[PDB]
Design an enzyme around this catalytic site. Structure first.
Site, PDB file in Angstrom:
ATOM      1  N   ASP A  75       0.707  -1.354   0.169  1.00 11.95           N
ATOM      2  CA  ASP A  75      -0.011  -0.105  -0.164  1.00 11.95           C
ATOM      3  C   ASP A  75       0.800   1.074   0.054  1.00 11.95           C
ATOM      4  O   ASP A  75       0.644   2.152   0.603  1.00 11.95           O
ATOM      5  CB  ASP A  75      -0.993  -0.123   1.017  1.00 11.95           C
ATOM      6  CG  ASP A  75      -2.061   1.055   0.947  1.00 11.95           C
ATOM      7  OD1 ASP A  75      -2.790   1.119   1.880  1.00 11.95           O
ATOM      8  OD2 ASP A  75      -2.136   1.592  -0.185  1.00 11.95           O
ATOM      9  N   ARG A 115      -0.034   9.175   0.398  1.00 13.63           N
ATOM     10  CA  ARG A 115      -0.899   9.295   1.524  1.00 13.63           C
ATOM     11  C   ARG A 115      -0.264   8.725   2.708  1.00 13.63           C
ATOM     12  O   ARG A 115      -0.702   8.902   3.888  1.00 13.63           O
ATOM     13  CB  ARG A 115      -2.352   8.993   1.055  1.00 13.63           C
ATOM     14  CG  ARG A 115      -2.299   7.382   1.206  1.00 13.63           C
ATOM     15  CD  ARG A 115      -3.875   6.875   0.832  1.00 13.63           C
ATOM     16  NE  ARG A 115      -3.822   5.917  -0.377  1.00 13.63           N
ATOM     17  CZ  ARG A 115      -3.849   4.599  -0.383  1.00 13.63           C
ATOM     18  NH1 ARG A 115      -3.903   4.357   0.885  1.00 13.63           N
ATOM     19  NH2 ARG A 115      -3.568   4.029  -1.407  1.00 13.63           N
ATOM     20  N   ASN A 116       0.408   7.476   2.328  1.00  8.72           N
ATOM     21  CA  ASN A 116       1.092   6.654   3.427  1.00  8.72           C
ATOM     22  C   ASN A 116       2.808   7.063   3.512  1.00  8.72           C
ATOM     23  O   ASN A 116       3.426   6.209   3.866  1.00  8.72           O
ATOM     24  CB  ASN A 116       1.136   5.051   3.048  1.00  8.72           C
ATOM     25  CG  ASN A 116      -0.358   4.920   3.277  1.00  8.72           C
ATOM     26  OD1 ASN A 116      -1.190   5.452   3.975  1.00  8.72           O
ATOM     27  ND2 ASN A 116      -0.901   3.738   2.552  1.00  8.72           N
ATOM     28  N   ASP A 129       1.733   3.099   7.309  1.00  7.95           N
ATOM     29  CA  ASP A 129       0.597   2.156   7.025  1.00  7.95           C
ATOM     30  C   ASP A 129       1.245   0.860   6.707  1.00  7.95           C
ATOM     31  O   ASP A 129       1.120   0.413   5.496  1.00  7.95           O
ATOM     32  CB  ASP A 129      -0.376   2.696   6.028  1.00  7.95           C
ATOM     33  CG  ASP A 129      -1.742   2.348   5.926  1.00  7.95           C
ATOM     34  OD1 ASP A 129      -2.029   1.789   7.100  1.00  7.95           O
ATOM     35  OD2 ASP A 129      -2.493   2.765   5.138  1.00  7.95           O
TER      36      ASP A 129
END
Ligand SMILES: Cc1cc(Nc2cc(NC(=O)c3c(Cl)cccc3Cl)ccn2)nc(N[C@@H](C)CO)n1
Length: 295
Positions: free
Chosen positions: A136, A140-141, A154
């Site tokens: 992932d 955003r991570n 994450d």
């Protein structure tokens, strides 16, 4: 393989104070707080992440996060055993890189962008050494400790669906490798180079697999020289073994970060500046960042 001798630290609820709510998503809530251990005279700025199935999922993340230790990866400081267990980690004061590139576009120069690419590749190559597949990786991570220091987070999908960031083998065959993380790395770079554009905006996820099979890829961002876009294109190759290795990505972006204006063309890139640990940046008396609180 080798025994995982990592320490799982249990922290008392009374040892930390929740200041405010940072945000709420499709998981629960992230809080900003202060961890004040026993009689240690330290205040560590922290982030607190909060049914049986829910506790299994969060303890699986605690396990992965407690098993990593790198300057470019977010580690678990500890857990708190309330009704629903809380994950306690280092507060990354500037939030995620995706929102950061969106909000600070007018002050982000080539040096910052190429350094982030090196740092993300460093963290990713570390996960590869520890034999962890992120599954992932996205802007955003990636969290911002300071504008000059970013870390990957994450680990909820990390193993020893985000369609628009996945390698075609993952979409079609659920195959996940370090080489499929390389694809996600290419997309992450694209997100940075476009100052947070949504990949394949307006296109539904159902059409992605078919678009990739035909040979279509994300477009060349306007600031990208052929040198930089060529790297992104290489990350999106069909043959997973053809894609660069993260150790090669560190090398490639490092050479470029030494002469950033030759690889990224940004109007005003030179007279642009972001907060540094000179004023503003930081009772403030006994606060110690988690990176300096070693035990
Ligand atoms: C100003 C600011 C700082 C900060 N710091 C922070 C955020 C963390 N967030 C996460 O770890 C997180 C991510 Cl990056 C994805 C999914 C779930 C979580 Cl808890 C962790 C540590 N510090 N986070 C935020 N907004 C969060 C909602 C984004 O996640 N805003």
């Amino acid at each position: 393989e080798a025994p995982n001798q990592a320490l799982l630290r249990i922290l008392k609820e009374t040892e930390f104070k929740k200041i405010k709510v940072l945000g709420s998503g499709a998981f629960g809530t992230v809080y900003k707080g202060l961890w004040i251990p026993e009689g240690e005279k330290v205040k560590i700025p922290v982030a607190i992440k909060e049914s049986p199935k829910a506790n299994k999922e969060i303890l699986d993340e605690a396990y992965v996060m407690a098993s990593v230790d790198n300057p470019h990866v977010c580690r678990l400081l500890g857990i708190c055993l309330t009704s629903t267990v809380q994950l306690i980690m280092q507060l990354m004061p500037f939030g995620c890189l995706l929102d950061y590139v969106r909000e600070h576009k007018d002050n982000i120069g080539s040096q910052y962008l190429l350094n982030w690419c090196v740092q993300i590749a460093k963290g990713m190559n570390y996960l590869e050494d520890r034999r962890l597949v992120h599954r992932d990786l996205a802007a955003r991570n990636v969290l911002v400790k300071t504008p000059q220091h970013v870390k990957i987070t994450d680990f909820g999908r990390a193993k020893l669906v985000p369609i628009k960031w996945m390698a075609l083998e993952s979409i079609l065959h659920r195959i996940y490798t370090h080489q499929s993380d390389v694809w996600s790395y290419g997309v992450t770079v694209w997100e940075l180079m476009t100052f947070g554009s949504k990949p394949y905006d307006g296109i539904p996820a159902s059409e992605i697999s078919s678009i990739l099979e035909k040979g279509e890829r994300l477009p060349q961002p306007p600031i990208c020289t052929i040198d930089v876009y060529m790297i992104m294109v290489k990350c999106w190759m069909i043959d997973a073994d053809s894609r660069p290795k993260f150790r090669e990505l560190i090398i490639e972006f490092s050479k470029m970060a030494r002469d950033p204006q030759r690889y990224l063309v940004i109007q005003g890139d030179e007279r642009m500046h972001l907060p540094s640990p000179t004023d503003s940046n930081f009772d403030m008396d006994d606060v110690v960042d988690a990176d300096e609180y070693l035990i």
